Amino acid sequence: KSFVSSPIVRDSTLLVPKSLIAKPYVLPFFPLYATFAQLYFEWTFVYLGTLVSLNILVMLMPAWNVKIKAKFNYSTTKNVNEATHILIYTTPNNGSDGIVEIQRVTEAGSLQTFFQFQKKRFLWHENEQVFSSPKFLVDESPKIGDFQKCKGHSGDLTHLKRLYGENSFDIPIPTFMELFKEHAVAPLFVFQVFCVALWLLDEFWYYSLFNLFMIISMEAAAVFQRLTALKEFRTMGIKPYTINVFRNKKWVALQTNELLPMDLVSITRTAEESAIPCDLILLDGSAIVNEAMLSGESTPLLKESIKLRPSEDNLQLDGVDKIAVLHGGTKALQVTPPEHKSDIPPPPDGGALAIVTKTGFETSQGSLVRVMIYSAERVSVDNKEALMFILFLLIFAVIASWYVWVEGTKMGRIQSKLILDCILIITSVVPPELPMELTMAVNSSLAALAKFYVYCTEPFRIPFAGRIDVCCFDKTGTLTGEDLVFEGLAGISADSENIRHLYSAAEAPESTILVIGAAHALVKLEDGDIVGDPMEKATLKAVGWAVERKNSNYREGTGKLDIIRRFQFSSALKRSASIASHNDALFAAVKGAPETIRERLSDIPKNYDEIYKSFTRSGSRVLALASKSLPKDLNRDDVESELTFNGFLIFHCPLKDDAIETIKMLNESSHRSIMITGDNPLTAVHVAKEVGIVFGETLILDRAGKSDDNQLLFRDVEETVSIPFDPSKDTFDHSKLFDRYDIAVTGYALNALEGHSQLRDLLRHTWVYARVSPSQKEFLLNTLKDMGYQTLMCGDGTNDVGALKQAHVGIALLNGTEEGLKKLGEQRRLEGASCAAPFTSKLANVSAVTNIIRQGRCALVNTIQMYKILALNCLISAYSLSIIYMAGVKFGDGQATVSGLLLSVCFLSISRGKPLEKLSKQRPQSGIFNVYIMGSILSQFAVHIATLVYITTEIYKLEPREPQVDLEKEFAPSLLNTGIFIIQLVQQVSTFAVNYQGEPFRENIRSNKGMYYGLLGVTGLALASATEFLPELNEAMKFVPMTDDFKIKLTLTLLLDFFGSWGVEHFFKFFFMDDKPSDISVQQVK
Which neighbouring-strand residues pair with 264? Answer: 246, 355
- Helices 975-994 and 931-958, axial angle in degrees (round to 10): 160
CA dihedral sign of residues 198, 202, 208, 211: negative
For the beta carbon of residue 777, count every other beta carbon within 10 angstroms.
Answer: 26
User: Which residue stretches of 519-625 are H helix?
Assistant: 534-543, 594-598, 608-617
132, 6 contact by CB (below 8 A): yes
**Which amino acid, one-letter code, is at 467?**
R
704, 724 contact by CB (below 8 A): yes
* Three-state secondary structure readout of 1023-1068: HHHHCCCCHHHHHHCCCCCCCHHHHHHHHHHHHHHHHHHHHHHHHH
Give the integer Cα–Cα distance in Å for 643 and 802: 38
Q: Half-sphere exposure of 235 toward its Cβ, with a 13 Å CA cutoff?
A: 5
Task: Tell me whether residue 330 is annotated as binding.
Answer: no
**3-class DSSP assignment, residue 988:** helix
10, 22 contact by CB (below 8 A): no
Residue 182 CB burial class (10 angstroms; 0-12, 13-18, ≥19): exposed
User: Which residue stretches of 544-601 are H helix?
Assistant: 594-598
542, 518 contact by CB (below 8 A): no
Task: Tell me whether residue 679 is annotated as binding.
Answer: yes
Q: What is the chain's Cα-based Rg? A: 37
Per-residue b/e over 781-813, b at no fewer than 16 CB within 10 Å?
Answer: beebeeeebbbbbbbbbbebbebbebbbbbbbb
354, 436 contact by CB (below 8 A): no
**3-class DSSP assignment, residue 440:** helix
Question: Phi and psi at residue 313, in whole multiples of 5°?
Answer: -75, -55
* Beta pairing, strands 672-676 & 644-652: unpaired
Strand boundaries in 860-970, DSSP class E: 923-924
For the beta carbon of residue 269, count every other beta carbon within 10 angstroms.
Answer: 16
**3-class DSSP assignment, residue 355:** strand
Which neighbouring-strand residues pair with 623? Answer: 649
**3-class DSSP assignment, residue 51:** helix
**3-class DSSP assignment, residue 475:** coil
Residue 183 CB burial class (10 angstroms; 0-12, 13-18, ≥19): middle
In terms of Cα–Cα distance, which of 548, 545, 549, 642 is closest to 590?
A: 642
Which neighbouring-strand residues pair with 486? Answer: 651
Question: Phi and psi at residue 962, in whole multiples of 5°?
Answer: -110, 140
Give the integer Cα–Cα distance in Å for 421 and 199: 10
Question: Phi and psi at residue 812, in whole multiples of 5°?
Answer: -120, 110
Give the integer Cα–Cα distance in Å for 360 and 278: 7
Q: How does DSSP classify residue 270?
A: -
* Long-range contacts at 444-449 (CB < 8 A, ≥ 24 apart): 444/859, 444/862, 444/911, 445/855, 445/856, 445/858, 445/859, 448/855, 449/851, 449/852, 449/855
* Long-range contacts at 933-936 (CB < 8 A, ≥ 24 apart): 933/864, 933/867, 933/868, 935/1068, 935/1072, 936/868, 936/995, 936/1064, 936/1065, 936/1068, 936/1069
Task: Tell me whether residue 621 is annotated as binding.
Answer: yes
Edge-first strand listing for the sheet containing 4-5 = 4-5, 130-132, 123-125
DSSP secondary structure letters along 634-664? --HHHHTSS-EEEEEEEEE-PBPTTHHHHHH
Asked how this structure was determined, the answer is cryo-EM
882, 404 contact by CB (below 8 A): yes
Give the integer Cα–Cα distance in Å for 504 and 493: 13
813 CB-near residues (< 8 Å, 6+ apart): 477, 478, 794, 795, 796, 841, 844, 846, 848
Question: Phi and psi at residue 324, in whole multiples of 5°?
Answer: -95, -15
Q: How does DSSP classify residue 594?
A: H
Q: How does DSSP classify residue 330?
A: P
Cα distance from N-terminal residue to C-terminal residue, the chain: 73
* Long-range contacts at 610-618 (CB < 8 A, ≥ 24 apart): 610/499, 611/490, 611/491, 611/496, 611/499, 611/500, 611/648, 612/648, 613/682, 614/499, 614/500, 615/490, 615/500, 615/648, 615/650, 616/680, 616/682, 616/683, 617/682, 617/686, 617/717, 617/718, 618/686
Strand boundaries in 885-995, DSSP class E: 923-924
In terms of Cα–Cα distance, which of 737, 984, 749, 711 is closest to 872?
A: 984
Element containing residue 892 per DSSP (H, E): none
Question: Phi and psi at residue 800, in whole multiples of 5°?
Answer: -130, 90
989 CB-near residues (< 8 Å, 6+ apart): 902, 903, 906, 1015, 1018, 1019, 1022
* Beta pairing, strands 243-247 & 250-254: antiparallel
CA angle 421/422/426 to nearest 5° reads 115
554 CB-near residues (< 8 Å, 6+ apart): 546, 548, 560, 561, 562
179 CB-near residues (< 8 Å, 6+ apart): 223, 226, 227
Edge-first strand listing for the sheet containing 243-247 = 250-254, 243-247, 264-267, 352-358, 279-282, 325-326
* Beta pairing, strands 116-117 & 279-282: unpaired
Biggest alpha carbon distance in the chain? 124
Task: Tell me whether residue 139 is annotated as binding.
Answer: no
713 CB-near residues (< 8 Å, 6+ apart): 701, 702, 703, 704, 722, 723, 724, 725
**3-class DSSP assignment, residue 708:** coil
915, 226 contact by CB (below 8 A): no
Task: Tell me whether residue 638 is annotated as binding.
Answer: no
Asked about 474 being catalytic, the answer comes back as yes
226, 179 contact by CB (below 8 A): yes
Cα dihedral 200/205/208/212 (nearest 10): 110
**Catalytic entry in 263, 279, 284, 474:** 474
* Beta pairing, strands 470-473 & 791-795: parallel
| CA 277 to mean position of chain CA atoms | 27
Give the integer Cα–Cα distance in Å for 69 and 65: 7
Which neighbouring-strand residues pair with 11? Answer: 89
For the beta carbon of residue 690, count every other beta carbon within 10 angstroms.
Answer: 15
**3-class DSSP assignment, residue 282:** strand
DSSP secondary structure letters along 289-317? EETTTTT--SS---B--STTS-SSS----
Give the integer Cα–Cα distance in Å for 17 and 525: 64
- PDB resolution in Å: 3.5
Task: Tell me whether residue 800 is annotated as binding.
Answer: yes
**3-class DSSP assignment, residue 591:** strand
Task: Tell me whether residue 709 is annotated as binding.
Answer: no
Give the integer Cα–Cα distance in Å for 816 and 312: 46
Task: Tell me whether residue 263 is annotated as binding.
Answer: no
99, 15 contact by CB (below 8 A): yes
DSSP secondary structure letters along 804-864? HTTSSEEEEE----HHHHHHHHHHHHHH----SSSEEESS--STHHHHHHHHHHHHHHHHH
For the beta carbon of residue 309, count every other beta carbon within 10 angstroms.
Answer: 16
Cα dihedral 153/157/161/163 (nearest 10): -90
Task: Tell me whether residue 474 is annotated as binding.
Answer: yes
